[PDB]
Amino acid sequence: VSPPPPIADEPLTVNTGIYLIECYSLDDKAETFKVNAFLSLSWKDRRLAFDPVRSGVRVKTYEPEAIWIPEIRFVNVENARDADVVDISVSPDGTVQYLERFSARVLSPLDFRRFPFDSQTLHIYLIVRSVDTRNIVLAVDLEKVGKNDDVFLTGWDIESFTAVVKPANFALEDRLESKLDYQLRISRQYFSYIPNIILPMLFILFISWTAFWSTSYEANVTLVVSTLIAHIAFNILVETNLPKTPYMTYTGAIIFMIYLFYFVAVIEVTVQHYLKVESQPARAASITRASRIAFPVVFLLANIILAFLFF
């Protein structure tokens, strides 16, 4: 079967729509999400026109093999979508209404700069390649673009699902390609990060600072080194959940900065001990008293500077 012939020199318009049924498995590391949706296609094929009196039916149902169907593909998928045709309906003028239900693993990059307070725009790019006989162009039928109310993405808030109505038409290997951009806007549910990572990490840091109210070097060494180890554990935990980014993330910056605080606390604890042994505890006392104020103040100001730079 060949494509529909034109009335003039006009391209064939395939009206599209995606209606999300299921949204799942947003893998932060892989920068992928799985979708289960309806793909709706509509175009005119005057060769399929018919008389309702003669045929008996007001609308004819065809099997995909029986008629010409445009080869619509997803750009940013891992493998070809698993699709099952739901219906193909032809009206007397030859207007075809195609519907399939598909599932696909979409590959859409994520911006981790503001993690875990980041928002993303996930993309689903629809594409059609023009044939030699006719040029095929994609369109968005907004009445056929939407999402189910129950659509839930674990750890994410689904904001909107809209399509950029004007396709990106371009040449690829001496043939026209019509590409549509469906955008799923989401924002991360940061809640859990507060009791699971952020607050535990702050508590261990604050525990290290109790060494500023102790003259016991042996005890101080234990306090700062132990909490440092707990921080390393949280750092490894965070980096196992996130991909390796060529930029600094907000959590990354905070986690890294905290190492410097542990490093300087070790210096302070060492300096204080050196002085006590050198029979200069008056000088050591001045440093320890200053550290009690300096450490929380510098920590608070640095965090303000970071939150400012990132948000």
Ligand X SMILES: CCCCCCCCCCCC(=O)OC[C@H](COP(=O)(O)OCC[N+](C)(C)C)OC(=O)CCCCCCCCCCC
Q: Is 151 in the site for Na ion (CB under 5 A)?
A: no
Residue type, 227: T
Of these partners, its own copies, Na ion, ligand X, none, which one is at the site of residue 279 (CB under 5 to 8 Å by kind)?
Answer: none
CB of 35 to ligand X, least distance (A): 24
Q: What is the DSSP string of 230-296?
A: HHHHHHHHHHHHS---SS--HHHHHHHHHHHHHHHHHHHHHHHHHHHHTT-HHHHHHHHHHHHHHHH
The contact mask relative to ligand X for 190-209 (x = CB under 6 A, - = no) is x---x---x-------x--x
**Element housing 298 (H / E):** helix 281-310
Out of Cl ion, its own copies, Na ion, none, what residue 266 binds, judged by CB under 5 to 8 A for its kind, is its own copies
Residue 38 CA to residue 100 CA, distance in Å, equals 6
CA distance 28 to 183: 18
Return the residues of window 93-132 that contact ligand X according to CB under 6 A: 114, 117
Question: Of these partners, Cl ion, its own copies, ligand X, none, which one is at the site of residue 309 (CB under 5 to 8 Å by kind)?
Answer: none
Task: Choose between 100 and 118: whose C-beta lies nearer to ligand X.
Answer: 118
* Nearest-10 crossing angle of helices 281-310, 250-277: 170
Could you tell me the smallest distance in angstroms from the CB atom of residue 152 to ligand X?
A: 20
Report the alpha-carbon distance of residue 195 to residue 182 in Å, rounded.
Answer: 35
Q: Rule CB under 5 A: which residues touch Cl ion?
A: 73-74, 77, 80-81, 130, 170-171, 175-176
Q: Rule CB under 6 A: which residues touch ligand X?
A: 114, 117, 190, 194, 198, 206, 209-210, 213, 254, 267, 270-271, 274, 296, 303, 307, 311
